[PDB]
């Protein structure tokens, strides 16, 4: 495998933190959580593709191991379709009306819930939380800068 052992040890240590799985295994639905916590930013489509296009019911009746999870993360790191933050900060400007580097939080919540891969109301609230202001607007630039540092 084209992956050093130094970071592999830390990856194994992080994967062993779940525990709640019977033993050294991992569920299909919980695979994305461990894949996104270690690093990278895979999408739902990418997760379903690397997982071999699992069935709807297969996401809760089977479990994988680490020998199969390592190549998944390897491919996600090597092969990816993400992009830098320069394109993200410029994409959110489409919703800016006045053009003063601010956008309404409700519009961002709606765009995140409907447009794209859709997100639950529990996640969008935590995402937009903290950036509350008097005018109810959230600077997309600061939002992207904070999300990139996460």
Partner 1 sequence: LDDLLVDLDHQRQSACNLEKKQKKFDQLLAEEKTISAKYAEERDRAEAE
Partner 2 sequence: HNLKERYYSGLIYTYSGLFCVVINPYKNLPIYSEEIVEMYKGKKRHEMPPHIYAITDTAYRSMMQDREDQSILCTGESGAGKTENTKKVIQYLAYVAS
Partner 3 sequence: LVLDQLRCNGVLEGIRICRQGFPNRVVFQEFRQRYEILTPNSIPKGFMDGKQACVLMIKALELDSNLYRIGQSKVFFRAGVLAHLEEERDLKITDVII
Write down the least CB distance from residue 129 to partner 1, Å: 38
Kindly tell me which residue out of 10, 14, 49, 95 binds partner 1, with binding defined by CB under 8 A: 49
> Closest CB to partner 1 among 72 and 92?
72
Kindly tell me which residue out of 91, 123, 132, 136 binds partner 3, with binding defined by CB under 8 A: 91
Residue with tokens 């194994």: 12
**Structure tokens of 78?**
């090597």
118 binds partner 1 (CB under 8 A): no
One character per residue 30-69, x = contact with partner 3 (rule: CB under 8 A): -------------x-x------------------------
- Quick one: which of 133, 87, 142 has its CA closest to 106? 133
- Quick one: which of 143, 141, 145, 146 has its CA closest to 109? 143
Specify whether the CB–CB gap between 109 and 124 falls below 8 A. yes
- Residue 149 has, within 13 A of its CA and on its CB side, a CA count of 5
The DSSP 8-state label assigned to residue 64 in this structure reads E
> Closest CB to partner 3 among 10 and 87?
87
Measured in whole angstroms, the distance separating CA 30 from the mean position of its chain's CA atoms is 13
Query: Which residues here bind partner 3, judged by CB under 8 A?
Result: 43, 45, 87-88, 91, 93-94, 96-97, 99, 111-112, 115-117
Which residues are near partner 1 by CB under 8 A?
49, 52, 75
């Amino acid at each position: 495998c084209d992956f050093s052992e130094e970071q592999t040890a830390e990856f194994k240590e992080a994967f062993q933190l779940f525990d709640r799985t019977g033993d050294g295994k991992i569920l299909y639905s919980q695979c994305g959580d461990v894949m996104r916590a270690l690093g990278q930013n895979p999408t739902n489509a990418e997760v379903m593709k690397v997982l071999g296009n699992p069935k709807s019911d297969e996401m809760n009746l089977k479990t994988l191991k680490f020998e199969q999870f390592l190549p998944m993360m390897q491919t996600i790191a090597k092969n990816k379709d993400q992009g830098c933050f320069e394109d993200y900060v410029e994409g959110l400007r489409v919703f800016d009306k006045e053009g003063n580097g601010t956008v309404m939080g409700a519009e961002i919540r709606h765009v995140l819930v409907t447009l794209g891969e859709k997100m639950t109301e529990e996640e969008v609230e935590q995402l937009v939380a903290g950036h509350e202001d008097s005018n109810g607007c959230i600077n997309y630039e600061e939002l992207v800068r904070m999300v990139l540092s996460g």
